[PDB]
Design a protein around this ligand. Structure first.
Ligand code: HEM
Ligand code: HEM
Ligand code: HEM
Ligand code: HEM
Lengths: 141, 146, 141, 146
């Protein structure tokens, strides 16, 4: 469960991301594809090379979903219900892969927001991304 | 584990800039803060009540220094990690009974600390090289389990 | 999330356990200790040998908690809140270990209830134990 | 992986009673039912819409038979699982890109199927021996990743 302090930390850190939201999402995807090549197979219709407009566009989508989760942090199962159906049913994303993308999102935030990425905020962000991942893996059928 | 020459280059070049007195303690401290069940193995370290307490704890900084030393040793023997980590494997697996998932977690926390310290210099291809390394170290440390 | 069919399957399978509830819990613990020796360190004040009265007693406790979860399956976070505090805060149980005990509970049920352990019911029981595990690991601080 | 003689005995004695035409299909079918994301790798197998559809699918039964064959082969070479599973590792890791966590899951589903089939004969010490085996097989199949 996310504590009051966790929610405060996550909202504050994500607030600093700003107009870089889509950019950071795209970078996290790139980090995941390079670090954990098994994840690439979900995107055969994507060119996954650096500077790919498809990865850029997709990063924005991912970021917008995380922003939705932040904005509705006390109601995340409802807010992410459609996305849960998509990832679990249609795409059949292996639950391990959410841990991989979550780690790459943390690395991206650490690399861009050194002042915000305190140990306490790192812990809050990890709990938040684990909560998001729990919702997105909740619909396997 | 096999790194390309380009990856070896990226890894060794960055590691030469690492503050070996601090980065290990930062990684171990963050492990204790982010994954609080790991504190089970460090009751003798004293005050771990708050993140500030953990990060400022002299015992956490001192032990982190030895862990980093072990990672440094692994970087020098990337083609023989099993032999390099044999005694540490017996300690962590046979004596301490740490679940090996936590070896992976500490490696990933180290990667976060490197990203924090190096910023844009910690590029996605540099990270990918370091992920091969910390996976190799985790697997070698877990050898006594398998 | 547990579906209506999942809840029906779990209630039916657990209904067949009966007065063997405590016994099956004790057997699952024994399976876990023998199969995954890292888990033994949580019980230094226990004799973990076969026929141990402490493992027997503890198995009953575990079973009673699972029965509570079955009886309150739509309100499990509330029903298991005290147990969540215990395992995460005081005992600091590594989350991996819940997957290990869940697997040993499935093996125990399979070994004792061959008619009930259909593929559908196996799937429902796995989802149920994963849900229980999610609650019991929800309070790390 | 190292089994005691007592464990080797327990493992080989039970395996001789295994129905080699059915148990593999039961394990693969249950993997597909219990962990539905694994169906991603078997789109060519046809009807997987219901558990009954999965378990009755002739392609699931036929493939399960080969998997069991691989486990049988592993039981004959417990001290050289890496060599035994080398080609399968290249297939599952380099060609298929299956996450290795799923190797562990299938092994644990097999253990459940053995428990189902053998009942009280699948004692806790027999299970513990089989857990060493399926962990060994999973680690060997994942060698191309590490
Ligand atoms: C924090 C975790 C994640 C978030 C917030 C997220 C968010 C999203 C969003 C917003 C979309 C687009 C939805 C739409 O257009 O209708 C999407 C699609 C998709 N996601 Fe994710 N996702 C996450 C994790 C993952 C992971 C771990 C994988 C696989 C490794 C994955 C694979 C995909 C794929 C394959 C698509 C469809 C792309 C396409 O066909 O165009 N996602 N995700
Ligand atoms: C890649 C991962 C790891 C590395 C490289 C590593 C390295 C080390 C090193 C170098 C030592 C000092 C041994 C000595 O004094 O000779 C040590 C001790 C220790 N480690 Fe780690 N470690 C890792 C993961 C972990 C984790 C995840 C835990 C617990 C959650 C842990 C628990 C301990 C404990 C309790 C000791 C003290 C043992 C003693 O003094 O008797 N280690 N480790
Ligand atoms: C389905 C999962 C689990 C359930 C339902 C469960 C249930 C329980 C219950 C009912 C108690 C007694 C509470 C009390 O007396 O106040 C307990 C205590 C305990 N549990 Fe669990 N537990 C689970 C998983 C685990 C796991 C995976 C571990 C460690 C590997 C663990 C370690 C312990 C320990 C060490 C105690 C305290 C024993 C003592 O000091 O007497 N539990 N659990
Ligand atoms: C211990 C675990 C496993 C064993 C022993 C095993 C064994 C095998 C064997 C013997 C084959 C036949 C290869 C051939 O025809 O020469 C095969 C093929 C295959 N496996 Fe597995 N497997 C395991 C886990 C998995 C998992 C978890 C997945 C997916 C979730 C998977 C996906 C596949 C696929 C898609 C094929 C067909 C490949 C092809 O025909 O080109 N395997 N495996």
């Amino acid at each position: 469960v996310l504590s009051p302090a966790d929610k405060t930390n996550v909202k504050a850190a994500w607030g600093k991301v700003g107009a870089h939201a889509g950019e950071y999402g795209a970078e996290a995807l790139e980090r995941m594809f390079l670090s954990f090549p098994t994840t690439k197979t979900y995107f055969p219709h994507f060119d996954l090379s650096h500077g790919s407009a498809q990865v850029k566009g997709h990063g924005k989508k991912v970021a917008d979903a995380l922003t939705n989760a932040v904005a509705h942090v006390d109601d995340m199962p409802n807010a992410l219900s459609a996305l849960s159906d998509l990832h679990a049913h249609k795409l059949r994303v292996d639950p391990v892969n959410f841990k991989l993308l979550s780690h790459c999102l943390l690395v991206t935030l650490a690399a861009h927001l050194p002042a915000e990425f305190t140990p306490a905020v790192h812990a809050s962000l990890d709990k938040f991304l684990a909560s998001v991942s729990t919702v997105l893996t909740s619909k396997y059928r | 584990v096999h790194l390309t020459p380009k990856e070896k280059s990226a890894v060794t070049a960055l590691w030469g800039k690492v503050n070996v007195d601090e980065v290990g303690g930062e990684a171990l401290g963050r492990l204790l803060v982010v994954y609080p069940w790991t504190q089970r193995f460090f009751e003798s370290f004293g005050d771990l009540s708050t993140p500030d307490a953990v990060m400022g704890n002299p015992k956490v900084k001192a032990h982190g220094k030895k862990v980093l030393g072990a990672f440094s040793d692994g970087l020098a023997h990337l083609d023989n990690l099993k032999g390099t980590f044999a005694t540490l494997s017996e300690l962590h697996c046979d004596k301490l009974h740490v679940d090996p998932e936590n070896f992976r977690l500490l490696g990933n926390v180290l990667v976060c600390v490197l990203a924090h310290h190096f910023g844009k210099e910690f590029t996605p291809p540099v990270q990918a090289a370091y992920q091969k390394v910390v996976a190799g170290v985790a697997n070698a440390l877990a050898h006594k389990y398998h």
